[PDB]
Design a protein around this ligand. Structure first.
Ligand SMILES: Nc1ncnc2c1ncn2[C@@H]1O[C@H](COP(=O)(O)OP(=O)(O)O)[C@@H](O)[C@H]1O
Ligand code: SF4
Length: 1046
């Protein structure tokens, strides 16, 4: 903007601007429908402040509930509402009634719900009264309130009381309930975690119990209504003065789980109760929310506010209860909490700021330029609140790693921040700060930002046709229990039939009812799947309204996955000796040490056993074992394809075991960890498997903590502790580091399988409990998946394995492979592994595809085709031609583009033929893998294969094929285009590599050389394929052979 002239012409003034905001809201809230009435969703278009009275702020909002940009509705926020931080492009909901006419919301009328699909927990909202920062930090570093003793006592009491209210408050029965519940594995675990006495906890819990009885005698007495406790309860309901008499009749519901699209609130109502309010000689009956509190009898604002929010939650399910109850089990003293409009308003205003703070996490600085982490809500001046925070750790830490001549942040706190973060170096802070930034961006990616609107706005049918919304279902079969909050249910349709789609038994599913009034309820996972019925395990028992009730099941999306990574990052920053050690080895790249071999590096007694184990192993394997044994810090085992990383890890574990080391065995997937374990079972090496026995492989389930417990009926801290110390080897996944075992045990060694696939901050986790570690991986194979472009660009896809690989001292390669025949090996060897792979034997080397009856299959195919078009088919089927590229050039084989995805029906039809041929040539479908790069193309190939009713071969992307192999791999590359649209995906070297290494005996590759050559990995492949003349050009679709397929 120089000349007079630019200024002139740079004067704008609506249409691209309005549309750019629709894009803006779609970034964070994809597919927000926009609506009128009860569940209104309005898109903000314009925001300004004005002056009424004199010096009185108003906020002038221009909003729309429709996409046609002439449906503009005006809106004025007054008093405290005017200060809510709405910018344009936000999605809002006016719960202050209306939509009929929004106009004015102020002190005395209306609620404004900023980012309504963002359902924040009321407890976090209450927390933020005192400190908004503390709340945000709570929401995001979820583990930095460690489980205290009181929290344990707290849970136990809540639970006893819930059990009591459905039964009796008679002291012997309360004592019984206390006795039973103190023995539940769940609580034993926590006692274990906290190294507490079982009996001491029992004792402490027992002292509360007479209060339980006093309360029940007071309120649940069944006498004259004169004689119930007497208090003022000023409701909406007309007349609100004069005392009245309170009778709790029954508990109606316990742990009522409520999600509010209306207020952007979620909550769990401890106990829902039937209450009779007695008024002179008349009575009113109200279903009301009661919160149990295990601390001091504070009647704090936090505590009351909580209950106020529970009243709002309630409206999602029933009539507005107007008030709620605080119990304080310590004393048996119930307090009324009335939902005043002032409260409901004050809290919902504060709730907005919380939603804003949790959403406005990455800053541009110039709408388009590189990312920053947005600074959190500022540090308070209330130096008393601070004192006892626990979040102070992360607060000081977030401050120092992301802050700003200034500060002017309280100087009694400015020193605490330094005490807390004096142990850390600049590198460390930089590392923390970046890893958050990356994680946040990843978390905020559009894909993992879908709202629950599908569940509560569009009904059952419209959604079942795809994705997952199975829903016209009733239950009648009695609900079984399993343990605590894992109830087994059984559902099927009204009247008769009805379908399936993408709803595979194992899936995370959310179970709502029919009507909007029964949304949320219970969440869980699927057990089995008939097309007559559906069994799933849930956290809630669901009796309350039988028969009449229709239920919808739906899918899900986390992203708040980022809690675990964030945890590990926070733990890394702690000043403990293990965290220092990891800081230096990881952040500071301190060189790992290895000692030189001596006679007694191993316990004398281990040596025969170790020598035997070694003698089983190929040389680089032995070299690997040596490096681990000589390690002082860590070892990196490179598991090149087919080299037997599962056989190797088992061997290491056997050697370490023989040496009298404790080993923590971890991986990314349950499958991978279980595979190693299955091998170890054979060798009769003992181990305990942590994790959920349904996610654990069938034959390992016997070794599970879950199974062992139920099996051997473990009902004492000592017997649980016995099980925990029963095995030197403990096996879990990288995510399962939250187990109470890691509160109390450390290990000589941690081993991480698939270290190269696991995201770096996740991989970090099990290491905190290990003295020396071993990462197993191959960076030539797939990296951790990083969806967000920008994040990927900052280094987010660098596995911990690769990071540490820059110390070659620590790296040992597994190079002798047992998967590929020399021809198939030769490929990946020339392309990727710089000639380092060798065959495990001549057997492996010379193996060609098992095809028992080519003879009559070659004939049956000539019943339409030709023998004079042997060019390809003969070269394709010939087992002695193990590598083969089929060029879809002289037949046109065009790609089709449909909404983000790519397909190719020519290639699809082509491989489906080839598959059918090879099964008919005697290769079983089980031994066959189909690989395509495009999600969309896989669908087409599955369909076409079902059409040919040969369905037993798997079609998939490389991801779902890592460290598995098939005897015959077939690859449709799908890209085939005029000379334009060029993938990002095919450009990837590693993905190609995985594709070329899944095949044992026959590899078949199919795509258009013309367009494929434009991708470097493919370009180079074509070069090596030309040297051996392995490209075979397909004839025209006209030609006799192809004609009948197309
Ligand atoms: N040192 C070795 N000597 C002989 N065969 C081996 C050796 N290491 C691995 N193998 C073979 O290689 C194959 C691959 O190992 P396996 O653990 O079954 O799957 P993967 O290692 O590919 O996960 C096995 O069938 C195994 O017999
Ligand atoms: S420490 Fe004080 S300021 Fe930092 S979060 Fe906790 S409360 Fe808010």
């Amino acid at each position: 903007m120089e000349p007079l002239d630019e200024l002139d012409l740079l004067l704008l003034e609506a249409v691209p601007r309005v549309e750019l905001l629709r894009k803006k809201a779609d970034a964070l809230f994809p597919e927000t429908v926009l609506s009128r009435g009860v569940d209104n969703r309005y898109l903000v278009l314009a925001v300004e402040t004005s002056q009424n009275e004199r010096g009185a702020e108003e906020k002038r909002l221009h909003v729309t509930a429709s996409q046609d940009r002439e449906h503009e509705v005006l809106c004025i926020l007054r008093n405290g509402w005017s200060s809510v931080p709405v910018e344009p492009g936000d999605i809002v909901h006016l719960e202050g009634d209306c939509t009929s006419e929004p106009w004015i919301i102020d002190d005395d009328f209306g609620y404004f719900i900023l980012y309504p699909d963002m359902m924040i927990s009321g407890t976090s909202v209450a927390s933020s009264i005192r400190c908004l920062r503390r709340a945000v930090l709570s929401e995001t570093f979820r583990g930095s309130d460690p489980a205290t003793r009181q929290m344990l006592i707290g849970t136990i009491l809540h639970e006893v009381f819930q059990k009591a209210i459905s039964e009796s408050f008679a002291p012997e029965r309360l004592q019984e309930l206390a006795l039973q519940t103190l023995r539940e594995v769940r609580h034993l675990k926590e006692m274990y975690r906290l190294n507490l006495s079982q009996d001491e906890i029992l004792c402490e819990v027992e002292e509360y119990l007479p209060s339980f009885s006093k309360w029940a005698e007071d309120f649940m007495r069944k006498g004259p209504s004169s004689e119930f406790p007497q208090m003022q309860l000023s409701l909406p309901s007309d007349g609100r003065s004069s005392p009245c008499n309170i009778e709790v009749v029954k508990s109606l519901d316990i742990e009522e789980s409520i999600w509010s699209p209306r207020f952007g609130l979620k909550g769990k109502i401890d106990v829902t109760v039937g209450v009779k309010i007695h008024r002179d000689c008349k009575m009113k009956y109200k279903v009301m929310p009661l919160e149990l509190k295990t601390g001091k009898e504070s009647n704090s604002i936090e505590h009351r506010s909580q209950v106020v929010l529970y009243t709002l939650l309630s409206q999602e399910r029933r009539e507005d209860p107007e008030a709620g109850w605080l119990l304080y089990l310590k004393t048996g003293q119930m307090y009324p909490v009335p939902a005043n409009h002032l409260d409901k308003r004050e809290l919902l205003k504060l709730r907005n700021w919380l939603a804003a703070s949790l959403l406005h996490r990455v800053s541009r600085a110039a709408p388009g330029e590189e990312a920053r982490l947005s600074a959190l809500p500022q540090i308070i001046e209330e130096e008393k609140t601070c004192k006892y925070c626990s979040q102070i750790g992360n607060c000081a830490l977030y401050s120092r790693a992301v802050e700003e001549d200034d500060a002017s942040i309280p100087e009694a706190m400015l020193s605490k921040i330094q005490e807390e973060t004096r142990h850390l170096q600049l590198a460390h802070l930089k590392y923390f700060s970046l890893w958050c930034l990356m994680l946040t961006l990843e978390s905020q990616s559009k894909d993992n930002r879908k709202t629950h609107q599908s569940i509560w706005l569009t009904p059952a049918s419209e959604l079942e046709e795809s994705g997952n919304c199975v829903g016209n279902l009733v239950r009648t079969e009695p609900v079984s229990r399993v343990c605590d909050g894992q109830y087994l249910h059984n559902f099927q349709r009204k009247n008769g039939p009805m379908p399936a789609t993408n709803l595979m038994a194992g899936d995370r599913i959310i179970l709502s009812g029919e009507e909007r009034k029964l949304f949320a309820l219970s969440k869980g996972y699927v057990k089995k799947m008939n097309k007559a019925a559906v069994t799933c395990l849930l956290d809630r028992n669901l009796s309350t309204l039988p028969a009449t009730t229709v239920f919808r099941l739906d899918r899900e999306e986390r992203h708040g996955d980022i809690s675990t990574p964030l945890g590990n990052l926070s733990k890394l920053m702690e000043s403990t000796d293990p965290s220092k050690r990891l800081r230096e080895l990881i952040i500071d790249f301190r060189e790992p040490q290895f000692i030189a071999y001596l006679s007694s590096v191993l316990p004398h007694d281990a040596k025969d056993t170790v020598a035997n184990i070694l003698k089983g192993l190929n040389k680089p394997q032995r070299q690997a074992m040596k490096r681990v044994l000589l390690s002082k810090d860590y070892t990196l085992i490179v598991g090149m394809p087919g080299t037997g990383k599962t056989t190797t890890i088992c061997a290491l574990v056997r050697i370490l075991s023989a040496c009298g080391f404790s080993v923590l065995l971890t991986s990314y997937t349950h499958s991978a960890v279980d595979n190693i374990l299955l091998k170890l079972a054979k060798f009769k090496v003992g181990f305990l498997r942590l994790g959920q026995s349904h996610k654990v492989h069938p034959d390992i389930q016997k070794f599970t903590e879950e199974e062992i417990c139920r099996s051997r009926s473990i009902a004492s801290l000592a017997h649980l502790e016995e099980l925990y110390n029963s095995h030197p080897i403990v096996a879990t996944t990288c995510m399962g580091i939250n187990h109470p075992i890691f509160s109390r045990k450390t290990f000589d060694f941690c081993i991480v399988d698939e270290a190269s696939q696991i995201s770096q901050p996740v991989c970090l986790g099990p290491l905190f409990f290990s003295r020396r570690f071993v990462l197993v991986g191959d960076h030539q194979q797939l990296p951790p998946l990083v969806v967000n472009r920008e994040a990927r660009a900052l280094g987010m896809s660098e596995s911990l394995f690769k990071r540490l690989e820059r110390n070659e001292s620590a790296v040992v390669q597994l190079t002798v492979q047992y998967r590929m025949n020399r021809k198939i090996m030769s490929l990946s060897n020339k392309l990727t592994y710089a000639g380092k792979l060798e065959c495990g034997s001549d057997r492996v080397a010379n193996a060609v595809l098992a095809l028992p009856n080519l003879k009559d299959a070659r004939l049956s195919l000539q019943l339409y085709a030709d023998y004079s078009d042997s060019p390809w088919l003969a070269g394709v089927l010939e087992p002695d031609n193990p590598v083969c590229f089929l060029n879809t050039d002289k037949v046109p084989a065009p790609e089709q583009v449909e909404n983000g995805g790519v397909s190719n029906v020519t290639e699809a039809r082509l491989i489906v033929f080839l598959t059918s041929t090879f099964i008919k040539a005697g290769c079983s479908p089980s031994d066959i893998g189909v690989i395509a790069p495009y999600r969309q193309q896989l669908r087409i190939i599955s369909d076409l294969l079902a059409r040919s009713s040969v369905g037993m071969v798997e079609v998939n992307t490389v991801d779902k094929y890592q460290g598995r192999d098939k005897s015959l791999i077939l690859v449709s590359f799908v890209r085939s285009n005029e000379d334009g649209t060029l993938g990002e995906l095919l450009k990837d070297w590693r993905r190609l590599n995985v594709a070329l290494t899944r095949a044992k005996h026959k590899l078949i590759l199919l795509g258009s050389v013309s367009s494929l050559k434009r991708f470097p990995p493919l370009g180079t492949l074509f070069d090596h394929l030309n040297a051996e003349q392995l490209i075979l050009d397909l004839p025209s679709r006209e030609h006799e052979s192809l004609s009948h397929i197309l």
